[PDB]
Structure formats: C-alpha cells, structure tokens
Amino acid sequence: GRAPDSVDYRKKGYVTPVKNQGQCGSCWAFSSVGALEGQLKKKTGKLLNLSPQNLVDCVSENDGCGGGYMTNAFQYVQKNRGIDSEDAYPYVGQEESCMYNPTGKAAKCRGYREIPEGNEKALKRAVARVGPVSVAIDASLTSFQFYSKGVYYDESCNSDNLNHAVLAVGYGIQKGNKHWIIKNSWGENWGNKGYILMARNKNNACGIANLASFPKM
Ligand SMILES: *[C@@H](N)N(C)N(C)C(=O)[C@H](Cc1ccccc1)NC(=O)OCc1ccccc1
Ligand SMILES: [Cl-]
C-alpha cells in the first residue's frame, strides 16, 4: 500500500513530552489533546502542549475525573471554537469550573473521524495519512502495569474490555514483532519513558483498533 512500513511521529516533532494524569480519570483528555497536538504540528509547524484541564472542566458530556469519551472532547473543541494551552490552563488533576478563555486559544478543531471497528489495516493507514490517533485499549493486566521494553503481547488481553485511553504515535517492527507505538499518560517513569510498544496485526490485541478516532483541523 501507500502507507510506509514504519512511521514514528516522535521523530517528526509531532509529540509533546509524556504527561502524568495522576489519580484523576482524565485518560480521555490526555488522549484527545495528544491527537490535537499532532494535528496542530502538522497544520502549523508548531508543537504546543494543549490543555487536558480545559477538557476535564468544560466537556459537559463527559464526567471530568469520572471518565469520558475522546469523541466528546473533539466535538467540544469544534463547538467551542478553541482549546487553550497547558501553560496558561494547567493540569491540576481534579475537576474545576470551566475557565476556557479565547485569548489563550492554542488550537481549533473541525470535527473528528472514526477508524472502522477492529480494522488494524485502516488504523495503520490513518496513522500514516493523518498523524497520531486516539485509541482505547485493555490496560487492565498487571503485565501492562509492569511493562518495561519489547513488544507487549498478552493472550489474556481482551479486545472487548476497553478500560484505558492512549495515543498511537506510530507503528513499526522490533525483533520480528510488528507493533504500535503508544504514548501513555502515566508519567515518564512508567513503561519505556512513558511509552509502550503494543503488538500489531495480532488479531486486534487489547482492542487497539476497536474505538480509534482523530480530529480534523
Ligand atoms: C481514564 N483515566 N479513564 C478513567 N477512562 C478509562 C476513561 O475515561 C474511559 C476511556 C475510554 C474511552 C473509550 C472507550 C473505552 C474507554 N472512558 C470512559 O470511561 O467513559 C465513561 C463516560 C462517562 C461519562 C460520559 C461519557 C463517557
Ligand atoms: Cl471515544
């Protein structure tokens, strides 16, 4: 196909530093801003930390630290005509009243698109064509908690048990094992400096391609 065999948007400067969401159920907000940060770098050449807090406080269809959908975050940025920067709307790991200000607007959104349910070929073509893509996974296993290196594969991962939201920032192959390059929001001391390589084309391992989406900019 058109899509490269390997792409790593970290090497292209599309990916901001790894964040830590803390105990707040804001994985959906980190996943959403990571996809928007990628599109902002692609469309403008600038990499900026965007505000997950803006989403936690202001996306009324989501439950703040109580969880949320990435699609509701992209719909909010579009309807709201903006999202603020992290720097001036910082992450405080607790739900507060919405303090969105358009003077601090750092990005806009024109809606979102969904990858077809369970289609890893279509997720690869989207990551190649678009950039980083928001994904939901089964991150429930202790093997995931203690991940260090290599390509994560666990036969106990359940593609119908989506319980965490992360960001696919590329894909490739390592020691013969195809992978997705996944940015987590558990800080830089988790995983491989905050990243995990997750098995690719292993029958939608951990449900990586079951609820993937990206923003239009
Ligand atoms: C992350 N820290 N966190 C608590 N999670 C697991 C969520 O927020 C999940 C992420 C997710 C997204 C899509 C599919 C599967 C999992 N979202 C979630 O639990 O949404 C619940 C919700 C509550 C209120 C309004 C909308 C959704
Ligand atoms: Cl979602």
Numbering used by the authors: -1 to 215
Please share text taken word for word from the publication where this structure appeared.
Cathepsin K (CatK) is one of the most investigated cysteine cathepsins, both by academia and pharmaceutical companies. It is expressed in high levels in osteoclasts, where it serves as the principal protease involved in bone remodelling. Cathepsin K (CatK) is a target for the treatment of osteoporosis, arthritis, and bone metastasis. Peptidomimetics with a cyanohydrazide warhead represent a new class of highly potent CatK inhibitors; however, their binding mechanism is unknown.
The final crystallographic models contained mCatK residues Ala1 to Met215; additional N-terminal residues derived from the propeptide, Gly-Arg (98p–99p, propeptide numbering), were visible in the mCatK-Gü1303 structure. The active site cleft of mCatK contains the catalytic triad residues Cys25, His162, and Asn182. Gü1303 is bound in a substrate-like orientation, and its P1 to P3 residues occupy the S1 to S3 subsites of mCatK (Figure 4(A,C)). The cyanohydrazide warhead reacts with the thiol group of the catalytic Cys25, forming a covalent isothiosemicarbazide adduct through the connection to the C-atom of the nitrile moiety. However, a Z-configuration at the CO–NMe bond was observed in Gü1303 bound to mCatK, suggesting an E- to Z-conformational change in Gü1303 upon binding to the enzyme, most likely due to a "configurational selection" that we recently reported for an azadipeptide nitrile inhibitor of the protease SmCB1. The nitrogen atom of the imidate moiety, derived from the warhead nitrile group, is stabilised by two hydrogen bonds to the backbone amide of the catalytic Cys25 and the side chain amide of Gln19. The NH of Gly66 acts as a bifurcated hydrogen bond donor for the carbonyl oxygen of the P2 phenylalanine and the noncarbonyl carbamate oxygen in the P3 position of Gü1303. An additional hydrogen bond is formed between the Gly66 oxygen and the carbamate NH of Gü1303. At the P2 position, the phenylalanine residue makes nonpolar interactions with Tyr67, Ala134, Leu160, Ala163, and Leu209. The P3 benzyloxycarbonyl capping group forms nonpolar interactions with Asp61 and Tyr67, and the phenyl moiety of this group is stabilised by a T-shaped π-π stacking interaction to the 4-hydroxyphenyl group of Tyr67. Gü1303 occupies the non-primed subsites S1 to S3, and B-factor distribution showed that Gü1303 is rigid in the mCatK active site.
